[PDB]
């Protein structure tokens, strides 16, 4: 239930091995399971060589806070998982980006958090790990092998990312105005003006529910409703081979567009299946990814389908009279 989506925890032995680009959706999901995306991020941004998630995979990733509702659902994507799928971009942190207090950053190699206008990740170089405060990377002899466990990866917030239905700019302005009405005291969130203020305090940790609706910044909400609907779309199913691994792009395409590959009850319901009469040695099987579905948020008197939805810790500034 909380285990891997399609692929068990990776067992790497060659930290210099290249990370291939896989076109198939199931192949990308398998890479996400093994934390290949986080390793690629660290290689691209942090002068790091090797892998994270050794023997544990994405299912063993550390979370802040430790109790995570959406981590139980292995099918709910995180900001890094959505980044690997082209859904968003986890930008490398700059000096202006704020590190939220509360997580245990000691020994972490990568950690990302959603900021008011995006998603920001911090990484460390080869043979280095974060200090207790997370401000600096220092030499760590336990990371010298380059094949690191999943607890070196920290994801901040209870976040689920999904395909969105774009909303007009006027709707976003209405949502933003309602959010400003709900948070009169807030002035700056992550260094971004929320309300116009004349005199503000220092940044403070700020645990808040938010939805990213594909606009300039996020819609932070205090009173809202959420409902999860299973739409049985193609992205909700992953095709594997039961021992070989994820199916190739062509195999997955044939399975999802021909109704001949076998699958679970939901896949047979939505796309059809042909059990028996084994044409191949062992056909691909497509199964529903374990998630509560797509989230629809009723906020400010309107229902939207956000790009991402979560409850996370940001840094906010309060008005000073």
């Amino acid at each position, epitope marked *: 239930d909380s285990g891997p989506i399609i692929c068990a925890g990776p067992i790497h032995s060659n930290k210099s091995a290249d990370i291939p680009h896989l076109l198939g959706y199931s192949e990308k999901i398998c890479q996400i399971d093994r934390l290949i995306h986080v390793s690629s991020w660290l290689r691209n941004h942090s002068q790091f060589q090797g892998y994270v998630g050794q023997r544990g995979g994405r299912s063993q990733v550390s979370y802040y806070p430790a109790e995570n509702s959406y981590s139980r659902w292995s099918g709910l994507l995180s900001p890094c998982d959505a980044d690997w799928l082209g859904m968003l971009v986890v930008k490398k942190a700059k000096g202006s980006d704020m590190i939220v207090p509360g997580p245990s950053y000691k020994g972490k190699v990568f950690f990302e958090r959603p900021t008011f206008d995006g998603y920001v990740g911090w990484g460390c170089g080869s043979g280095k790990s974060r200090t207790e405060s997370g401000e600096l990377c220092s030499s760590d002899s336990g990371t010298s092998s380059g094949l690191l466990p999943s607890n070196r990866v920290l994801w901040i917030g209870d976040v689920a990312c999904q395909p969105m239905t774009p909303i007009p700019e006027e709707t976003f302005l209405e949502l933003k105005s309602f959010s400003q009405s709900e948070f009169p005291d807030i002035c700056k969130i992550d260094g971004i003006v929320f309300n116009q203020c004349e005199g503000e305090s220092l940044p403070q940790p700020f645990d808040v529910a938010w939805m990213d609706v594909g606009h300039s910044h996020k819609i932070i909400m205090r009173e809202h409703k959420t409902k999860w609907v299973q*739409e*049985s779309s193609s992205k909700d199913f992953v095709c594997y081979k039961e021992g070989t691994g994820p199916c190739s792009e062509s195999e997955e395409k044939t399975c999802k*567009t021909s*109704g001949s590959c076998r699958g679970d009850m939901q896949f047979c*319901k*939505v796309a*059809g*299946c042909e*059990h028996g009469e084994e044409a191949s040695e062992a056909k691909c099987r497509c199964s529903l990814v374990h998630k509560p579905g797509e989230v629809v948020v009723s906020y400010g008197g309107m229902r939207v389908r956000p790009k991402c939805y979560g409850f996370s810790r940001m840094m906010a500034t309060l008005e000073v009279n």
Partner: antibody
Amino acid sequence: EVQLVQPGAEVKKPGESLKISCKGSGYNFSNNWIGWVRQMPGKGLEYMGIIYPGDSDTRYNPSFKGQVTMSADRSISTAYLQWSSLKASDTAIYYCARLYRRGWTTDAFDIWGQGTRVTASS
Amino acid sequence: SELTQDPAVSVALGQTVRITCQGDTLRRHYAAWYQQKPGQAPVLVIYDKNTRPSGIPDRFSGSSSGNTASLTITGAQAEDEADYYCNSRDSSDNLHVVFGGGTKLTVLG
């Protein structure tokens, strides 16, 4: 090979509970939706809904939401259309069909039943 | 969607007929075309872009033009006088289907 069989005819009292059946043979009956359509005498074809007998799931036409109930019996490979109130307008030919799906783009009722004529004879 | 159809199509002699049904869901989903002679059960004649079940005459063809789908009958003889229905995937619900109203046909004799 694959076929759906229905009773030839089924006469009943108006206002009486009634239940028609469609039994599938030649394939795993629980792997395909079974859809029901109606044809009034001398009128067009109107589609009620589809029942998946794998878990007896249903998807109705908005027109047919409380008028009829679709049930499934996976063990004997049967689908059922029941009324509990025959009324008088329900005198029509009822067809069961097997919905064959190819991905997210194709829905076809390749196999069709022969039809049950239900008459509120009076 | 709703898959609107013309209630009747004029007698196209022995010429080519272009029975058409239009709807929103036809933008992304193919339309399956069934034919029903009067007194017989409906018979699926087209079920993909152009895929045709065995036994159906080759004159039946399927085409999609965006928001509309067409069943084309090249040689319209006395056999084709029937009611033609189009059905497709429901746009709102991936597990649901939507049926057309049905189109008549006429030929000579």
